[PDB]
Design a protein around this motif. Structure first.
Motif, PDB file in Angstrom:
ATOM      1  N   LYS A  78      31.184  36.275  30.060  1.00 44.41           N
ATOM      2  CA  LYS A  78      30.847  34.876  30.350  1.00 44.41           C
ATOM      3  C   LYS A  78      32.089  34.052  30.683  1.00 44.41           C
ATOM      4  O   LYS A  78      32.205  32.884  30.310  1.00 44.41           O
ATOM      5  CB  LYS A  78      30.037  34.245  29.215  1.00 44.41           C
ATOM      6  CG  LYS A  78      28.655  34.863  29.074  1.00 44.41           C
ATOM      7  CD  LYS A  78      27.893  34.294  27.898  1.00 44.41           C
ATOM      8  CE  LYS A  78      27.455  32.871  28.180  1.00 44.41           C
ATOM      9  NZ  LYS A  78      26.595  32.322  27.096  1.00 44.41           N
ATOM     10  N   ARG A  79      33.023  34.674  31.386  1.00 49.41           N
ATOM     11  CA  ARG A  79      34.181  34.031  31.983  1.00 49.41           C
ATOM     12  C   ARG A  79      34.147  34.292  33.482  1.00 49.41           C
ATOM     13  O   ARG A  79      33.246  34.955  33.992  1.00 49.41           O
ATOM     14  CB  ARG A  79      35.475  34.551  31.356  1.00 49.41           C
ATOM     15  CG  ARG A  79      35.624  34.169  29.906  1.00 49.41           C
ATOM     16  CD  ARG A  79      36.938  34.641  29.316  1.00 49.41           C
ATOM     17  NE  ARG A  79      36.988  36.088  29.161  1.00 49.41           N
ATOM     18  CZ  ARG A  79      37.855  36.872  29.785  1.00 49.41           C
ATOM     19  NH1 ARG A  79      38.753  36.345  30.600  1.00 49.41           N
ATOM     20  NH2 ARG A  79      37.833  38.179  29.588  1.00 49.41           N
ATOM     21  N   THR A  81      37.584  34.240  35.054  1.00 46.84           N
ATOM     22  CA  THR A  81      38.967  34.662  35.195  1.00 46.84           C
ATOM     23  C   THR A  81      39.110  36.120  34.736  1.00 46.84           C
ATOM     24  O   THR A  81      38.216  36.679  34.102  1.00 46.84           O
ATOM     25  CB  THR A  81      39.846  33.710  34.379  1.00 46.84           C
ATOM     26  OG1 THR A  81      39.354  32.380  34.559  1.00 46.84           O
ATOM     27  CG2 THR A  81      41.276  33.687  34.879  1.00 46.84           C
TER      28      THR A  81
END
Lengths: 97, 347
Positions: A78-79, A81
């Motif tokens: 759930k990023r 980057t």
């Protein structure tokens, strides 16, 4: 003045680099890298050019596959980057560490 | 007996050959531009730098007195030096370039010099009265010869295979045998070396086989003998030709260096098996190997790099405690509660 919002000039160059297929690594630094880390196993070796081309294509394909699986891990957490614990996770799961 | 890497020498490049004295204190590093670098062990220093010549110094030999080297080059001068201040006493500008010089061990007026083409003829120091050592065939063009250990004989070797033995100065033909190489094809000789205790010696042939003989056995053989070898050494896996052989400090551990791979092989005289393969920088080609007589450390000369190979005493030093033996579990014994000899001290 004129600027884009961030992400736009990512998605373009993503479409561009997925279309074009050539090298992406400048070949004289790569040839000096190969001669460097082949110095330590035998002195006075002599590479043909096609062998250096083959090493370049194999290393490029390996890094591309590693970054695809790293992208999968990063979207899973759930990023957006990429952090180096994702790369360490991917090489832990694949069975090479 | 050597098992480690232990250090090396980046002091002066272009090293070519070396040897030792009887005591093993210095190190006469032969160089390409006509130099002999002398380095110390117990103080690790370079005492004297004799800038001898400009040409490749090929052979070297120490004498017993600790004063008189002897060398030669493509300068083709049978030189001589002294370690006090670098005193070139004599200078013999001669033809027919040289491979090996060798003293008599105690009659050090007599040196033995191998030319390029014809027979080795015994030179001296003062006079030019070279003593011609008669080789019969003379068509082989590469004939090598040497003393025994005590200087009591002269052993020779041709390129056909026939071995002749002469007396050290009056040349008594006492032993004659051709070597049993193959069945129909014999081979040449490249070196013959000798120990410091006993009269065993090796025959560095050129079909990749070292053969070992004893002096008493061939003196029992004598004229027209067929001496069988004590030991036959080779390496059939790696298929390796040889460059330079030597002996141990007792004549037990043969140290033969390769000519392809920069590796040392060590055998035993008695059993005859390999005991350890040494290694170093994998990208070199090795020329000269020096053995140390009283303490087993080896020197390896390749690409100007000379390496020191000890074994570090990893067991431990035990100087303090012959006593104080160890109890593993906590052993307790706590029940307990409590002018015969006159030897000459002035000897």
């Amino acid at each position: 003045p004129h600027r884009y919002r961030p992400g736009t000039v990512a998605l373009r160059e993503i479409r561009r680099y997925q279309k074009s297929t050539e090298l992406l690594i400048r070949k004289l630094p790569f040839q000096r890298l190969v001669r460097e880390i082949a110095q330590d196993f035998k002195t006075d070796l002599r590479f043909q050019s096609s062998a250096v081309m083959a090493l370049q294509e194999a290393s490029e394909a390996y890094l591309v596959a590693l970054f695809e699986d790293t992208n999968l891990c990063a979207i899973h957490a759930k990023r957006v980057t990429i952090m180096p614990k994702d790369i360490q996770l991917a090489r832990r799961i694949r069975g090479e560490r | 007996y050597p098992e480690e890497a232990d250090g090396t020498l980046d002091c002066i490049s272009m090293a070519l050959t070396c040897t030792f004295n009887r005591w093993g204190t210095l190190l006469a590093v032969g160089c390409n531009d006509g130099r002999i670098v002398i380095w110390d062990f117990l103080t690790r220093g370079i005492a004297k730098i004799i800038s001898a010549h400009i040409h490749p110094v090929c052979s070297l030999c120490w004498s017993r007195d600790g004063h008189k080297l002897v060398s030669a080059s493509t300068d083709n001068i049978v030189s001589q030096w002294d370690v006090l201040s670098g005193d070139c006493d004599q200078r013999f500008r001669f033809p027919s370039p040289i491979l090996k010089v060798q003293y008599h061990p105690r009659d050090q007026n007599k040196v033995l010099v191998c030319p390029m083409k014809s027979a080795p003829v015994m030179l001296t120091l003062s006079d030019s009265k070279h003593v011609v050592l008669p080789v019969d065939d003379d068509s082989d063009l590469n004939v090598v010869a040497s003393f025994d250990r005590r200087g009591e004989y002269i052993y020779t070797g041709n390129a056909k295979g026939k071995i002749l033995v002469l007396k050290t100065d009056s040349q008594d033909l006492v032993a004659s045998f051709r070597v049993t190489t193959g069945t129909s094809n014999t081979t040449a000789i490249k070196s013959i070396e000798f120990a410091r205790k006993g009269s065993c010696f090796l025959i560095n042939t050129a079909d990749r086989i070292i053969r070992v003989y004893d002096g008493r056995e061939i003196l029992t053989c004598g004229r027209d003998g067929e001496p069988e070898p004590m030991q036959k050494l080779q390496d059939l896996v790696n298929r390796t030709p040889w460059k330079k052989c030597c002996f141990s400090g007792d004549g037990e551990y043969i140290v033969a260096g390769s000519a392809r791979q920069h590796a040392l092989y060590i055998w035993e005289k008695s059993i005859g098996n390999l005991v350890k393969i040494l290694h170093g920088t994998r990208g070199e080609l090795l020329l000269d190997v020096a053995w140390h007589p009283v303490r087993p450390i080896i020197a390896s000369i390749s690409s100007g790099v000379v390496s020191i190979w000890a074994q570090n005493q990893v067991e431990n030093w035990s100087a303090f405690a012959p006593d104080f033996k160890e109890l593993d579990e906590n052993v307790e014994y706590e029940e307990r509660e409590s002018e015969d000899e006159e030897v000459d001290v002035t000897s």
